[PDB]
């Protein structure tokens, strides 16, 4: 109920991507009733959204009612498009980042922007990142948990982390491209189980890949409370100790040593989970995030935090806004 | 350190299965050096094990040294063989279940058996389960988290559940058949991450598949503290409420209402995780299990539980033996 | 440097009061560091303290170094809790009073206790004052400068004064509940200016309220040299003379006639102020008090008194100890 | 008995201000009888006054009798009207300031004027000050201890301070708008305690607001001997040093450094208080002021100063007239 | 159901005694789980107690429900520490006695204190008794049935008895330090058999030591209905008459002569035993005692006494309270 | 005054057991006054015995005057010799038992024999018991309260109880091997206190060991009225109910339920003790026994019983002879 690090927004409209690039697989936003729209992917309706998914005016009103001071605006992860031709993804990114920035310019005290990057093309990614930071004023970017067959340990991605560290660009890591078919095509498993699993993999990949070691000043936040990591860290740490031949060939330090090296959002829904999150990740490293405006998010921003008997007000203020400011490298004076 | 619900054993030898059944893909145990052996899985060393993996006397020595009163013996999950022809899997199950039974006969106050079933063939599975319970005297069986393309919600598996409820046969669900390749091939991910994710899916599938509702007297225990479930239950339960169209077509009950309806082992390694586990699953529902004799399990059986200052004696006693006895439906007198 | 009539202490721990009583607004002590703790007011820090605030052995050690023979121990004024439900305030008083008594038992030659009362419920206050004096052996109590809407002239409080007179219970009056917000939120104004003004109001209210006239044997000591009163008494006295319609309908004696009829502590920091204080209040009515262990108090107890070339040695000894013994009705022999 | 820096006067008549401006809350003077009149502020009688409150000839007769050479005339503080519309307050100021000027014009050897300003509107205040100074020939103005929610540290008022320093317009600060109701509704507390408290706040605000530091040639005089300040400066100075985090964020210099940086009137009623006042504020900085014609003031002007055993004649002449001339920037042959 | 002579209490916390004294072997109380604390003696938890063992509010509540008017509070016998350095046992006694005094002063109508002494050092014991009686106001002390190698006949202990007789300090003698190992290591024998036997030895040692002869005004009460003494007194008294050379060297009077010379508690569980006790010790010398809060005690205080159909009301009132008052030299009125 | 169940006798002479066996420690008898003698433990004297301790005529003489019809003759407890090498103990037993039988031959209407057994070697013991019963005609045996470390609950001793129960051989349990040194080396404590405590332990051991439960036809009599047991049974029964984890793991039934399952002698000296004995154990289960010819025994056999006017003739006759006959399995005709 001050800062929302984890919220998604789309332009109200964008050009026909298949016409523009010449191949399909892209997503389009289709208005059909008033206040509602459908996301389509070359046939099937992928998702139904309301006006709050694109109209900043609608958003600030809801934000006012819920006590949210500022949302960090990122695109919807389906937009990542890491699978496409590198310049076409770059072309979509620039469209999406410009749209984000234009929203931010309209309400500089209610919004910051987290840009998207053509991660399948590292040199291109680095330059769009410099542009988001130097030109658009963005404090960071949102990237997926993996880039095609690259997990975040991939040395192909090291130029991206280097630039991010140098530019002081923060990385919000969002799970995407879970298995959607086969056994996972029931009970909403890719969102309920697959995303937390993606995030756990990403965390393990950066730790055991040495990313945090090689880039000690890189600021990273993971979505949904780090997925399963705060609970399974015991297993992950014990395994690493037991088979260094399988786990330690890239980075010899136990994953335990990295607790306190990264942030997670606070989006875990239940009080017992939130308490464990802060016990493992640290009261300084957990950031209120909401998945606004999506149903699987916290419908009442900061309300779980507000209800925690155990948290003193200093702690609650950290989770609500303080940690987000530190993660984004911003000062209170702006909001 | 009273009772270990989670322990694996193998016969010291068994026939060439490739020659026996006519096709490859099976595992053999080879005694390459004294007190050690290799598990071969066509061409490669799947795992290296010591004599405690096959020798009951060695096990009993190690049990005494650690204050373990009884081990529930199950096969090594790689032996499930659900991919094979049903009569062949059944023939192997019989060999493995018979060998387990011999071990229990020789040391009845130190061992109980959990059999293995040809799960890909439900009718054959019911018959072997009948055999394990009636003829072999097993209080339960160990099954995997999925059977080829079937998750545990599969209506095909319903006769297996009905028979287990009937026979008062407990089920120990063990993650197996995770993704071993692609992105999962590095950093021991299939054990560290793939396994708890498999267990989360299995719990979700039994809940949302309506297994616990249809069979309310069926006793089920999940491995590794239920994977990620105690941490992510908030998400899963919230998601269920938000998308009944995806999550509630087979069973209308919210997943949270099955907290207290099933068991998990206590194998989560860290005290914070063990506390959350007991907080979520319940003190009557968490069972000491060790993954003996594998190094990814607990080196010192019950040590974690005993170190928990928050638990009183009677709680610790439940965790160490009482819950296992309740789960298996056995009595203290006899051990 | 003999007796300190103005010193505060807290128990090292006490129950969660919000849970015990059912509503918030209470204070707790949080031990968060090495020899350091914070007073929290519903999770919000309002004072940081050190072990000398709760540890009698640490206090004795500092007293020894400073040459302090005895401290009159009272609770921290924020603990008064006059705003709460009467039986809840009473329950907290009994807890704080019992604690004070146990500290005096440990060091009967180094401490006396000044108890706290549920002043908003005068009949409960009379009963707890009887307990403090008759059973706990306190020479007096500390009370606030006002009780919600009641200033100290309130006839509702007359039974408390009547009991105090009977019991020979001294009253140490401490300013509290000043306006903290609005214009007063800056520059530590509630402490630097608000507190002296509260005490001036209290003195004016006891005088014009006829309290000293109705209860001629009542012994009252005001904190911080009586606030602004010693300086502004000329104005108050002249005003009373000019508008008896506003000032004298409860008590006809001019306030100036009451100089010499009550005590103040000597905590005014400056020699010119100390000299005026003794000129106005009287050499037999000024008592050394330090506000230990708070930094706004006198860092070297008795040092200002000792530095006064205006005072002879007999006068310094009155201010250092003699007057305190007379106020409290104790004999030097027992210290 | 030479110069009275502190005396109030009203026009004998002024228009209905409610009808003039469109809203109530204003004060009116109604001559109910012979040499008597009442101040009304919608419904109640704020104050009863005599002819000496408006009639200059009458005032001069009493001046001659008391040996007062000159009165500095200011409006009654209730007339400040800082709560009204800025343009309306200014209109009233102009009316009151013009009236003051007319009275001085009648007896330029017996009166000087201190104007009133629309302080809630700093631009309009600077303009009317320039006017008072450049056209009406006033040596200074009288303003309140605070301006609605603004204390005298308020950055908003800096343009006013800058103009006063530039115009060499002295400031007389008079307490007003103290709390009138609640606990303060009794025993004339707003005048006897509230006013000295307001003045103490004003002094602290100007000091810790850095006013005297940024406007080193600003001439300021506070009413009633500076409230409580000369007695409590010890507490204020010690607290400043102990909590610079609260007190020093606008001006890091200790309050004690500013003794001698400002004046106060000598209106403290008692010799012990007058001596302390000059000991603290300085013999060159204390100015005879009487609060004529109000009863709470000094009834025999200068009598207290003249009776001062401890003062030599040169010091008395300073308190009686010398210091006023210095404060106002005027010369003894104006009179 | 009026007075309980026999109850034990501990402070909620005490310092690390090993740390304090330089050597181990002391007991500490650990608060690890809720409403429950572990008594730790180097290495081992030897007893688990609940909150009634240290929280007087909890005790008062259970007292009210049981109809118990007053408890005589004594420490747990394990705290006797007669084996340590005299000055260190004295240091511990002072801390334990001050705590008892503090509890008593909080409910002086509901508790009296029986203090503990450093009995292995008779001079130190005398001075602490003096303090317990004169300074703390205890009516008596609790001591063990033997002090290292001294039984209660030891000449070394005579200054203690003389002191107690002088001060009218009653003695409550409690068995402790029984053999715990060997044949006594089964069936709870040290408590069921060893404790009554210790008491029998103590009574024999004090009679045949002449303690009662040489201090005929010394008041002594023994625990658990005097152990086996009421039943075995015939054999003891006959053995005395038979071998005066072994038994009568220190005191020539037959043990029967001291029947009526001392008290016992009524804690013998059975009505036949209770009847014999009163027949042998006397209806004036038997005191209701409960061993609260230990389970070997009387669960429903005074219920055995009230069920005795043979006793008249006067006798029941004596057993329940009158005899206690006589033994303590207290009066009905103060409760 | 009819049958004495409890009398001791020795042969006039026996060999040198040290020479006979190869090691010392033993006891031999040595005359020194034509009817007085000495018992010797390898050099020194622990007992002064008379003619009646070996000479049957002297005994019948004394028996005739005291009105004693028959004495059950047992060896003196020092002779048990349970420590020594079992093959040697079997030997000495046969010597002692043969001597007993000889004495019975001389007066078959005045004496029965109670044999002794090599208790440390239960196989050798069963054999000697069959001999005693089958060839010597004894109705029972006398055994100590413990065998080395074995208490009577020891499983090792179970073949004996089976044998005794089989052969209908009554057991008289006599305390022996008390602690002689340390604290018990004064005031004749081993006999006065140590002996009754040994018996209490033996009874507890037999009840909680399951002895009476497993052998419901075993006839057992304890010496000295059961020690403390009749009086402390309340304590023992209550403790058993409170801590079944300590007391109830060998036999679940409460000790109270065995009242009436065994016998005791009537040697308790005092009428109040005798009455309690018959109240708790039952009039059918108390047996006149004298401890002849020892001073600690009863001088006037049956006098105590005869003095109990609360007993009728029938009761007194049971206590004097009838219970003894039932216990020994003998008919009155024989005598
Ligand atoms: Zn999201
Ligand atoms: Zn396993
Ligand atoms: Zn204070
Ligand atoms: Zn004025
Ligand atoms: Zn006790
Ligand atoms: Zn005997």
Curated annotation (Swiss-Prot), chains A, B, C, D, E, F:
Catalytic activity as recorded in UniProt: 2-amino-3-carboxymuconate 6-semialdehyde + H(+) = 2-aminomuconate 6-semialdehyde + CO2
Q: Where does substrate bind?
A: 47
Look at the named UniProt entry and state the broad enzyme category this protein falls under.
lyase
Extract the GO molecular function terms from the UniProt entry: aminocarboxymuconate-semialdehyde decarboxylase activity; hydrolase activity; zinc ion binding
Q: What is this protein called?
A: 2-amino-3-carboxymuconate-6-semialdehyde decarboxylase
Q: What is its EC number?
A: 4.1.1.45
This chain is encoded by the gene named: ACMSD
Top-rank taxon of the source lineage equals Eukaryota
Q: Where does Zn(2+) bind?
A: 6, 8, 174, 291
């Amino acid at each position: 109920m001050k800062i929302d690090i984890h919220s998604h927004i789309l332009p109200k409209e964008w050009p026909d991507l298949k016409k523009r690039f010449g191949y399909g697989g892209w997503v389009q936003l289709q208005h059909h009733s008033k206040g509602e729209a459908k996301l389509l992917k070359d046939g099937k309706v992928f998702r139904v959204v309301r006006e709050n998914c694109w109209d900043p005016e609608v958003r600030i009103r809801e934000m006012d009612q819920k006590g949210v001071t500022v949302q960090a605006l990122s695109t919807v992860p389906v937009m990542f498009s890491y699978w496409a031709k590198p310049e076409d993804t770059l072309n979509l990114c620039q469209l999406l980042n410009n749209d984000l920035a234009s929203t931010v310019v309209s309400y500089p005290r209610r919004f910051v922007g987290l840009g998207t990057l053509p991660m399948q093309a590292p040199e291109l990614a680095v330059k769009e990142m410099e542009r988001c930071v130097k030109e658009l004023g963005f404090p960071g970017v949102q990237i997926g948990t993996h880039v095609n067959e690259w997990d975040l340990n991939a040395q192909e991605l090291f130029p991206v982390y280097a630039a991010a560290e140098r530019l002081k660009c923060s990385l919000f890591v969002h799970p995407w491209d879970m298995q959607m078919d086969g056994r996972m095509a029931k009970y909403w498993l890719p969102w309920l189980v697959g995303m937390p699993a993606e995030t756990t993999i990403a965390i393990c990949s950066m730790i055991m890949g040495g990313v945090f070691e090689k880039f000690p000043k890189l600021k990273v936040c993971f979505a949904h409370g780090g997925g399963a990591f705060p609970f399974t860290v015991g297993r992950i740490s014990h395994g690493f100790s037991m088979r260094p031949d399988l786990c330690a060939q890239d980075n010899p330090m136990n994953p335990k040593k990295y607790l306190g090296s990264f942030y997670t959002d606070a989006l875990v829904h239940d009080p017992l989970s939130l308490k464990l999150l802060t016990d493992v990740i640290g009261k300084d490293k957990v950031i209120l995030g909401t998945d606004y405006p999506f149903p699987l998010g916290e419908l009442e921003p900061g309300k779980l935090i507000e209800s925690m008997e155990e948290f003193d007000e200093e702690t609650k203020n950290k989770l609500k806004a303080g940690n987000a400011l530190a993660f984004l490298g911003l000062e209170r004076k702006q909001f």
